[PDB]
Amino acid sequence: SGFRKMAFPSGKVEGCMVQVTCGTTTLNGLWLDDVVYCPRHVICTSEDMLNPNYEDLLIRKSNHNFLVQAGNVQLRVIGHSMQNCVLKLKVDTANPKTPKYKFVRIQPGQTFSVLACYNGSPSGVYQCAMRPNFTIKGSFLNGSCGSVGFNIDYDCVSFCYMHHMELPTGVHAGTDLEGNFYGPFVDRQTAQAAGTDTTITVNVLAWLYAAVINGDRWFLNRFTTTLNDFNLVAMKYNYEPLTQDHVDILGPLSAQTGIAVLDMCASLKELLQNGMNGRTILGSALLEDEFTPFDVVRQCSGVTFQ
Amino acid sequence: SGFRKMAFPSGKVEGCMVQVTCGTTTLNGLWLDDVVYCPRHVICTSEDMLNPNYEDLLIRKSNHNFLVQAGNVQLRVIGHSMQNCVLKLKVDTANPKTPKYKFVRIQPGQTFSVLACYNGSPSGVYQCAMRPNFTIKGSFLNGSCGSVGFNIDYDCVSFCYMHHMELPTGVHAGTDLEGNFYGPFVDRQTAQAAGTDTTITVNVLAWLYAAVINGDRWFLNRFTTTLNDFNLVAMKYNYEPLTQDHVDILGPLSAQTGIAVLDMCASLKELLQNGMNGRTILGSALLEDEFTPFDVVRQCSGVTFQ
Ligand SMILES: *C(=N)[C@H](C[C@@H]1CCNC1=O)NC(=O)[C@@H]1[C@@H]2[C@H](CN1C(=O)[C@@H](NC(=O)C(F)(F)F)C(C)(C)C)C2(C)C
Ligand SMILES: *C(=N)[C@H](C[C@@H]1CCNC1=O)NC(=O)[C@@H]1[C@@H]2[C@H](CN1C(=O)[C@@H](NC(=O)C(F)(F)F)C(C)(C)C)C2(C)C
Known part of the structure; x- marks a missing residue:
């Protein structure tokens, strides 16, 4: 647990x-x-x-x-x-420590690990999600540029991010490993806006499934809903619209818990409308959206790497 | 930032x-x-x-x-x-990858990194604090035993924890690298209680200093207090009593921000008594106690390792 x-x-x-x-x-x-x-x-x-x-x-x-x-x-x-x-x-010299690797462009909502570095030396490692507005919520100081984001698929390191800059709201921006920024950002010290940051709905549902798996399930009401009625309520709270693709990805979690995605959507609707009332879910007083369905499955199985 | x-x-x-x-x-x-x-x-x-x-x-x-x-x-x-x-x-064979290391017994309130493992293979890494009740809030499944907790002091890995078991409230228990459990726990599948878990006050104050450093400072009131008056209020909320040693450790953060520890204690008192009112601090709707003053200083400087 x-x-x-x-x-x-x-x-x-x-x-x-x-x-x-x-x-x-x-x-x-x-x-x-x-x-x-x-x-x-x-x-x-x-x-x-x-x-x-x-x-x-x-x-x-x-x-x-x-x-x-x-x-x-x-x-x-x-x-x-x-x-x-x-x-x-x-x-002139190949890295003798070069692992099996690939360069990937991650999609919004997807997560990755950041190894924060200063002067070529690793300082720490933390997890981030690429926000829908193409920003990340990191912890980067002067000298941190060039610190990279990655995922591991058993033996293959997939590089997806390189740190370049920090925006006015404290959030971060960078590129993939081909040099293309995620978002409308430019590498120039000039005022730039991130734009309205929305909530990764499929990730919030995945986090509600992890809570249910871990015994935490007070929020589970007796109501159900439809994709259009849930979306009509979620857009009012700046939530990303849930699609049938999102429903299919939640499949393994829905099967492991015996809870239909649309039932979990209705409980999310009542949590958005009536709040948490000072209660917590997995030790948190907010709805968490930085865990993908894959992050939840990996942790509720113990997927290991080389 | x-x-x-x-x-x-x-x-x-x-x-x-x-x-x-x-x-x-x-x-x-x-x-x-x-x-x-x-x-x-x-x-x-x-x-x-x-x-x-x-x-x-x-x-x-x-x-x-x-x-x-x-x-x-x-x-x-x-x-x-x-x-x-x-x-x-x-x-019969020494590990050719043996780093410079030492075995240490950490104190309650102190933090460490856990490299969660299954079948001898690393799955993930996360940070934990040794709670005042000698439990940790991990993420461990079947096969995770033997996964270790550690700190890094530039080149030296300091091992402080080895995972052994999970308690009824979902929390975890284990030993140092000499085999002595932290807490009153025994390695037997029998009902065992963790005991009242209190809040690491010095860590909450350190986290309030990180919030101030990062521009987040709405909670800063115009009041001040004494160590005995703050302790009298903190014990009502299950907070560990703040001592002069704790005040001295907060020194570098107090100096970097221009805020006396006792002033920060009064703001913590009003946060405990009146709540957060749906507002957040560093993106959290709860008071965070798993960051030591050293964790905050390391992150507000970018301390690197070999
Ligand atoms: C590279 N080491 C740093 C990383 C920064 C340092 C503070 N925290 C970070 O994430 N990159 C920079 O300093 C980049 C760099 C010039 C300016 N800069 C910024 O991040 C600035 N941001 C902007 O001007 C803005 F808002 F547009 F993003 C700064 C004011 C320093 C935060 C270049 C070339 C973009
Ligand atoms: C070692 N791989 C596991 C780690 C457990 C597995 C589930 N999550 C964990 O942290 N250790 C155990 O299974 C230990 C082991 C026997 C029983 N056990 C427990 O953790 C059990 N706990 C207790 O009986 C209690 F409450 F006293 F801690 C269990 C019921 C499986 C959670 C031994 C030798 C303690």
Whole structure:
């Protein structure tokens, strides 16, 4: 029993972190094979960050202007290219610790582990969800850029995120490992808005199923509803509209507990309309939306990795 | 900015996990140097767990009754001893991945990372606090025993916990790495009570300081209090009594924010007496007590590890 927010083991990603310095600016890089990936704003000064022209700024840089360091060991840079907002530095040495990996673009609602890094060294690991507004709720300070997000599929590390910036509301923004930002964000120190953040409904239902599995089920009322009537109520609370695809993904949880998705939707409706009354669910006084149906199944089975 | 519950990177501990089988019972072991450590109830059958006599049960076991497996590789057991509730199996091969380590007994209120394991393979990592009642709020299923808790001090892994059992209220219990349980718990399948769980006051104050650091400070009232008047109110809410040692540990946070500990105590008093009114602090509708002053400082600086 017990339900906790859990990150994937980070060992396979720890071996891929390096420190990338250009001028005075130092950040983290991801060393896979003979390529190091980092945010392209490593070439900027503080002044440049205000309105950068990355092409012109990069045109003044050679391979020798990039200091790539793995522990107390320097890697020799023999190539460099800008791919969208990421800089790829080709090095003469392949990472002997390169795991089986792939680059993926995660969808909103999906979760991933973040290994927060400073000066190429891991500081900590935590779980995040890609919000519907393409922001994350992380914990990143100066030097954290280049810290990556990932999932583990038994032996294969799937990289999905690279940290670039923090927005005015305290939330975070970054790119996939090809350099494309999630959301409308740009890598420039200029005022940018995240936009209305909605609640990942399928994840809230998955979290209600974990609560039921773990004996916590006071919220289960005797009512039921329809997808359109539930959606009509959920949109009033800024909840993402539940679809038949979402219903099918909740399938294994619905089967393991004997509770129809539409019955669980009606209990969610009464929780949204009447609140929690100071009571808790899994030790929380709010409805939690950062656990996918897969996160709940993995934890209610104990899925292990290599 | 941003404040998240963060586990230490788990790579150094991943290399120490092995699978220990005795009869049909399989659990996790911690392989450091030429010794493997696991819960002594690996020698029990389901029936034995009801009222075990570990000495007599162990007396029927030889080195060859213990199957120790690292990946798809068997370790040859050449010695075995019971140290309190842990079984230590001496193997012919030292772990080539043994990091710099030490065994420590943590105090209540202190936190640590748990690398949850099944069949010797890591499944996930999360942070826990040793409650004042010597229980933890984990996420452990069948096979999770032998999963360990640890802290990292730059290069040195400090092992402080080994999982053994789950109590009736869903909470967890285990031992240090010498086999002594935290709390009054025994490794026997018999009804056992955790006892009244109190709130780690110094940690709640540390979490209020992280909230202030991260711009969240609505709760800051214009009142102040004394240690005895605050304690008189905190004991009514099952809060651990704040001491001058606690005040001194909050020092760096008090200095970084310009807020006296006793002023922060008065705001905590009004939060306990009048509630949060549906408002949140760091995205939480409850007062959080699983972040020590050290956890807050580490995150509001970005302390990194080897
Ligand atoms: C990279 N190490 C940091 C990560 C930041 C540091 C504070 N917390 C973080 O997440 N990235 C930056 O400092 C980026 C960088 C220039 C400005 N910057 C920002 O994150 C700024 N944000 C913005 O201007 C905004 F709102 F548009 F996102 C900052 C004001 C420092 C928070 C570049 C190139 C975007
Ligand atoms: C070891 N792999 C498991 C971990 C358990 C499995 C479910 N979640 C956990 O934390 N340890 C056990 O199954 C231990 C083991 C016998 C019984 N057991 C328990 O945890 C039981 N608890 C108790 O009887 C109680 F309340 F006293 F703690 C159980 C009923 C299965 C929860 C031994 C030797 C203690």
